[PDB]
Amino acid sequence: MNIFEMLRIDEGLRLKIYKDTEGYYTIGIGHLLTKSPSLNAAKSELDKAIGRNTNGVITKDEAEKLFNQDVDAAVRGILRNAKLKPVYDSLDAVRRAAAINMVFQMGETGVAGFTNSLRMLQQKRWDEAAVNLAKSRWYNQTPNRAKRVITTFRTGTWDAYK
Ligand SMILES: [Cl-]
Ligand SMILES: [Cl-]
Ligand SMILES: [Kr]
Ligand SMILES: [Kr]
Ligand SMILES: [Kr]
């Protein structure tokens, strides 16, 4: 298992525009298109990302290319973030995959706001952090996924994904 496989499980794969758990237009492997209520705005954004007139539909290869770019940007965002980088660098490989999933889902800004869990993860206080992470709107809104990611930070293994 790796970050790619991990997020493909968490996000699924859809080739037609769809709404995500917050009702926003997305496509692919969780590639958010826009926060706008306008389906045309979403279609415009999709055509721009793909570089062709998609008419709301893409291929698996195109979904995978956007997925690659999104994982990349997520990592890069972490590395450039003064609040994130030091934490991520102190983590082992498994846990880092957990941090990327979070940033992938809620953004850099969003994750940078978990000040307390962040410090606990830097200190290797696994159980404590898992309890703090769960006290969040993130967990109450998407509890099955939050639990998987939380277990991954807690244990440092992929058990939650097998
Ligand atoms: Cl894009
Ligand atoms: Cl969920
Ligand atoms: Kr992090
Ligand atoms: Kr994190
Ligand atoms: Kr976090």
CATH of the domain at 81: 1.10.530.40
The Cα 99–Cα 75 span in angstroms is 9
Number of domains in the chain: 1
Residue 161 in contact with residue 2, Cβ under 8 Å?
no
Structure tokens at 147: 């639990």
> What separation in Å is there between the alpha carbon of 42 and the centre of ligand 1?
12
Residue nearest to atom 1 of ligand 4 (CA): 99
Q: Is the CB of 87 under 6 A from ligand 3?
A: yes
Which residue, among 10, 26, 1, 13, has the nearest Cα to 61 in the 3D structure? 13
Q: Is the CB of 102 under 6 A from ligand 4?
A: yes
Indicate the SS3 state at residue 34: strand
Q: Which of 11, 45, 62, 108 is catalytic?
A: 11
DSSP H helices, the chain, are 3-11, 39-50, 60-80, 85-90, 93-112, 115-122, 126-133, 137-141, 143-155
Q: Is 11 a catalytic residue?
A: yes
Q: Is the CB of 99 under 6 A from ligand 4?
A: yes
CB neighbourhood size of 71 (10 A): 18
Buried b (16+ CB within 10 A) or exposed e, 130-159: bebbeebebbeebeebbbbbbbbbbebebe
Distances from the Cα of 110 to the Cαs of 1, 9, 106, 127, in angstroms? 25, 22, 6, 21
Q: Amino acid identity of 147? A: K
Buried b (16+ CB within 10 A) or exposed e, 79-118: eebeebeebbeebeebbbbbbbbbbbbbebeebbebeebb
User: What is the structure's resolution, reported in angstroms to one decimal?
Assistant: 2.0
Residue nearest to atom 1 of ligand 5 (CA): 118
Technique used: X-ray
Query: According to the annotation, is 32 in a ligand binding site?
Result: yes
Indicate the SS3 state at residue 35: coil
Q: Is the CB of 17 under 6 A from ligand 4?
A: no
For the chain, the maximum distance between any two Cα atoms, rounded to a whole number of angstroms, is 50
The Cα 92–Cα 43 span in angstroms is 39
Indicate the SS3 state at residue 65: helix
Structure tokens at 120: 């606990």
Query: According to the annotation, is 132 in a ligand binding site?
Result: yes
Where in the sequence is the domain holding 54, given as residue range(s)?
Answer: 1-162
Residue indicated by tokens 């709404």:
19
